[PDB]
Nucleic acid binder design. Sequence first.
DNA 1: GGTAGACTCGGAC
DNA 2: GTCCGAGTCTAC
Length: 251
Amino acid sequence: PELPEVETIRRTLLPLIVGKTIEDVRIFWPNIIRHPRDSEAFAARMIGQTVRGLERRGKFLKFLLDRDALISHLRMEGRYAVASALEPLEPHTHVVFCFTDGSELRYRDVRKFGTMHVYAKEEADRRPPLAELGPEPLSPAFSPAVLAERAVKTKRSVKALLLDCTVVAGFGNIYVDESLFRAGILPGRPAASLSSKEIERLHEEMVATIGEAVMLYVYGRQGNPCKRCGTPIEKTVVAGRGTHYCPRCQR
DNA sequence: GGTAGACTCGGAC
DNA sequence: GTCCGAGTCTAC
Ligand SMILES: [Zn+2]
């Protein structure tokens, strides 16, 4: 799921788990657990804690318990569900949090690719994976000035810059390509080559693109006409990623 | 100390 | 058998 979908998960999951107390934690793929590194310690420490809140940072979910925070990343295909302990698990279920009321929070992923870290709440923001995370794209902390300062300091492409979690939190490949199209900027442009005007426009389109999604021109549209000018959309590799752009609209 | 490479995984190709 | 996404860790 991308950032907007993670926000939807945050908002929908919270009422389904708030105030429930963890009775057991069952782990079927220990490698998902990144901290404590021992999955048995991860399970043991969560037992007895009640779920108090659920926040989002970038694409991370932060489950707030009594003492601890569980920080979860679903990557491309991870999913959460709340269901009865009496019913069979869905395929590819890797971690289950069992509550005292006979319900469960289940994490599944066909790709078996996500991560979980647990720390004392007061520590979570200063440990991986949250440490160093950049500002929320929809926050005033993500400003044209912040974007410009990062851009002038790097030799990297503008796409690489936007994909950098330290620059802006959880702005995915799809929204990078869409935002750059809407701003009229080629993804392979050196970040330092952008004018103040281009930076301002880019920031504006990033906020609009992700704001609209929480409330496609190019992504996956290679070979099809641009919706704005009719030129075939192209796909190349930029910053190690599939990259979609209109070679007329973007400069 | 900025930046690229290694590392996870399995469905699609 | 290879490709590919995110984000952390490793190493230059
Ligand atoms: Zn176009």
